[PDB]
Design a protein around this ligand. Structure first.
Ligand SMILES: *[C@@H]1O[C@H](CO[C@@H]2O[C@@H](C)[C@@H](O)[C@@H](O)[C@@H]2O)[C@@H](O[C@@H]2O[C@@H](C)[C@@H](O)[C@@H](O)[C@@H]2O)[C@H](O)[C@H]1NC(C)=O
Ligand SMILES: *[C@@H]1O[C@H](CO)[C@@H](O[C@@H]2O[C@H](CO)[C@@H](O)[C@H](O)[C@H]2NC(C)=O)[C@H](O)[C@H]1NC(C)=O
Ligand SMILES: *[C@@H]1O[C@H](CO)[C@@H](O)[C@H](O)[C@H]1NC(C)=O
Ligand SMILES: [Mg+2]
Ligand SMILES: [Mg+2]
Lengths: 93, 610
């Protein structure tokens, strides 16, 4: 595989509440493998795993059991998949 | 009975006869035998190994000829050539982009070139003139020539060239033969590039290494797994001489008649040079040279006692030093053993010891700049040493361990452990010292971020900074200007302050995403950026910046310092200030201290058990 964008529909939840219509989330799967040898290179480091590139954000109205009006909420999801690095949390091990 | 062809087969070094086809193996058991040359007079065969990442030698006259490890710390040594006159050894590296040189015993590594080298490949020598020749097939394919001393480097081919894989000389006719693997030909030229005339025009699948003998050419080809051979002058007689090869690489004609005897300008006295007597084209045809990072004195012959200003670095799996006396900024891989996760580091100009920590070995360790004398200082009761500091005056060692959230102190050789700062501390790391004034400085993390200060005994702990603090990972002091410098990774910013708490201005704000390593030395401040895997410097008074090495993974922490020059004194130096164990200086005067299990006596100097 080569780091494609797989899709599947899901509902969004706040526990007892549930969104009216669903939402197609995307999941970065695939195998962003290491680049092969340069054509005139001698044969025989980095880690470029398939990671969410850009994110999207949609508004979905939330619905809760009888007695309450349809609350509204905004949720952000995955849009594109690329192969980048990872540098955020700062610790030792 | 005629030219024996020595070639590297990725797994062993073989030797064919040009007349007939029984190939005798020279050295087997190799993993990726790439380039090879020889020193017939000394009877040695050198070769490279891109998988073991090293260059080895063996005496072919001696039976059961055990190998001799010559180099280690290379990335992709694609080319190699021996200097059978000045007893020197030149090689290239297509990844680190440099061309080094050393003696035969692997000693005295000097980087001769690091500029404008994309993917250098093959290299050839002519020591009787003092000219080295090499090729490059990367961004701008070219064939360069230069003095074997590292001078008069001139690009001699740049037109109609793409994959100049192989290269050799015709000493009898003073010409230059190279082969292009994509442009599919072999051309000759005079030793400067003039009268480039064609030899073999077609019929070359993918050659890699070319060699010459008498009026006959010999080269390896990759797509055919064989050794072709043609006439040196005419393109006629395209032949197969040795076919069905595993994976042929570099080939030379193996005979003394390819390394002609000539007179050495270095003579018996090594040309008077202290270290390296390299060949040169300019009179007197040699030039004295110093190893990487060490500058040459006014003699033009006598090297300096090591490199003066020096920048020691800690990565995760290795330790590396970078000399500051030369613009090459070559990071010498400090030859050490069992370094799983090196964190903090410091130096001691008095003894020449490098004190570094490790959170998976759980030990504070100590070594020379060379890498000899690797010894464990503190072995047990150690969790996460994110910061270490050397009191070069009182001969004591300080460190911070956030696993136990405490700061302790011993003498430089591990003895006399005493817990100084135990309480009111949240993930502390960096630590610098000022023994002349008698204050210690340190930082902790973002929950209650601060840069606290106390004496060397754990007294009068006064919190220095409390505002606009995020991830203060580094700390450094400029003693001559009474100001301390720190650096933050959460605020993505680095600022300065005076010890009086007077000025507090931001130095650089633009592109400092995440600094962990941090040090200061004489109007320059060096830092180690995570997320960019780079190291730069900043001018103190100015704000200029200079990338010294970019793209280096697993970067941690560094401290810059001088070698064999130290400053500062206080009462603790004189016979340990009369203390039996610990001499902890502070403005009130020194204070003798005992470890655990011992107590302080009436004289407030000695220590015995109860
Ligand atoms: C040291 O070795 C050289 C060259 O030997 C060659 O390489 C080794 C690995 C063996 O495979 C040998 O069979 C090869 O020839 C010897 O030089 C030879 O000298 C004479 C006998 C002649 O055949 C000449 O063409 C060769 O170059 C050399 O004699 C040897 N040293 C000693 C003391 O024997
Ligand atoms: C270094 O270790 C050595 C022994 O391994 C020690 O040096 C001497 O140790 C004895 C025994 O405690 C003391 O009485 C001496 O005073 C020490 N010598 C000096 C010059 O102080 C010591 O534990 C460590 N430190 C030093 C400085 O030697
Ligand atoms: C740290 O914060 C406390 C209260 O937030 C404040 O009183 C104190 O002055 C701060 N530290 C310094 C050095 O001012
Ligand atoms: Mg060569
Ligand atoms: Mg390169």
């Amino acid at each position: 595989y080569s780091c494609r964008e797989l899709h599947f529909t899901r509902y969004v939840t706040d526990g007892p509440c549930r969104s009216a219509k669903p939402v197609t989330e995307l999941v970065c799967s695939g195998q962003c493998g290491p680049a092969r040898l340069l054509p005139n290179a001698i044969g025989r480091g980095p880690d470029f795993r398939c990671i969410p590139d850009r994110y999207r954000a949609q508004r979905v109205q939330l619905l809760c059991p009888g007695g309450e009006a349809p609350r509204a909420r905004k949720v952000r999801l995955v849009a594109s998949c690329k192969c980048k690095r990872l540098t955020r949390f700062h610790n030792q091990s | 009975a005629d030219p024996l062809l020595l070639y590297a087969n990725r797994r062993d070094l073989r030797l064919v006869d040009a007349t007939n086809e029984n190939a005798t193996i020279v050295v087997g058991g190799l993993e990726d035998a790439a380039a090879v040359d020889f020193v017939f007079s000394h009877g040695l065969i050198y070769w490279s190994d891109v998988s073991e990442e090293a260059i080895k030698r063996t005496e072919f006259n001696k039976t059961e000829s055990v190998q001799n490890v010559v180099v280690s710390g290379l990335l992709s040594p694609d080319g190699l050539a021996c200097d059978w006159l000045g007893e020197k050894l030149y090689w290239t590296d297509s990844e680190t982009n440099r061309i080094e040189v050393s003696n035969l015993d692997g000693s005295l590594r000097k980087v001769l070139f690091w500029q404008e080298l994309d993917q250098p490949r093959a290299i050839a020598l002519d020591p009787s003139s003092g000219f080295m020749y090499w090729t490059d097939w990367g961004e701008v394919p070219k064939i360069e020539r230069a003095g074997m001393d590292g001078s008069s480097r001139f690009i001699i081919i740049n037109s109609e060239i793409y994959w100049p894989n192989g290269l050799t000389l015709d000493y009898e006719e003073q010409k230059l033969y190279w082969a292009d693997a994509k442009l599919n030909f072999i051309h000759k030229s005079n030793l400067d590039g003039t009268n480039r005339q064609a030899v073999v025009k077609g019929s070359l699948p993918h050659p890699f290494a070319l060699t010459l003998f008498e009026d006959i050419l010999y080269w390896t080809d990759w797509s055919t797994h064989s050794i072709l051979a043609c006439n040196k002058y005419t393109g006629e007689g395209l032949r197969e001489i040795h076919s069905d090869i595993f994976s042929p690489m570099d080939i030379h004609a193996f005979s003394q008649q390819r390394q002609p005897n000539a007179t050495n300008p270095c003579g018996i006295d090594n040309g008077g040079c202290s270290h390296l007597c390299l060949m040169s084209p300019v009179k007197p045809f040699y030039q004295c040279a110093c190893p990487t990072g060490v500058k040459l004195l006014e003699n033009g012959k006598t090297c300096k006692d090591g490199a003066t200003e020096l920048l020691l670095l800690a990565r995760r799996t290795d330790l590396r030093r970078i000399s500051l006396d030369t613009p090459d900024f070559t990071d010498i891989v400090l030859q050490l053993e069992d370094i799983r996760h090196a964190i903090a580091i410091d130096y001691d100009p008095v003894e020449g010891y490098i004190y570094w920590t490790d959170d998976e070995v759980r030990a504070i360790r100590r070594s020379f700049i060379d890498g000899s004398g690797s010894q464990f200082v503190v072995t047990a009761q150690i969790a996460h040493p994110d910061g270490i500091a050397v009191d070069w005056v009182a001969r004591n060692l300080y460190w911070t361990d956030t696993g136990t959230d405490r700061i302790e102190v011993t003498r430089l050789n591990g003895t006399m452990r005493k817990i100084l700062i135990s309480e009111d501390l949240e993930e502390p790391r960096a630590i610098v010292l000022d023994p002349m004034v008698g204050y210690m400085y340190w930082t902790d993390w973002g929950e209650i971020p601060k840069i606290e200060r106390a004496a060397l005994d754990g007294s009068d702990r006064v919190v220095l900074v409390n505002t606009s603090l995020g991830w203060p990972n580094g700390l450094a002091l400029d003693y001559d200007e009474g100001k301390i410098y720190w650096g933050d990774a959460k605020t993505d910013k680095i600022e300065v302050m005076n010890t009086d708490g007077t000025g507090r201005r931001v130095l650089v704000e633009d592109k400092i995403p995440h600094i962990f390593g941090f040090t200061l030395l004489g109007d320059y401040v060096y830092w180690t950026d995570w997320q960019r895997r780079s190291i730069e410097r900043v001018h103190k008074r100015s704000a200029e910046r200079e990338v010294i090495i970019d793209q280096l993974p697993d970067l941690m922490g560094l401290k810059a310092t001088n070698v064999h020059r130290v400053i500062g004194s206080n009462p603790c130096a004189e016979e340990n200030g009369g203390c039996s164990h610990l001499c902890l200086y502070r403005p009130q005067g020194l204070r003798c201290a005992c470890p655990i299990g011992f107590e302080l006596i009436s004289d407030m100097k000695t220590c015995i058990v109860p």
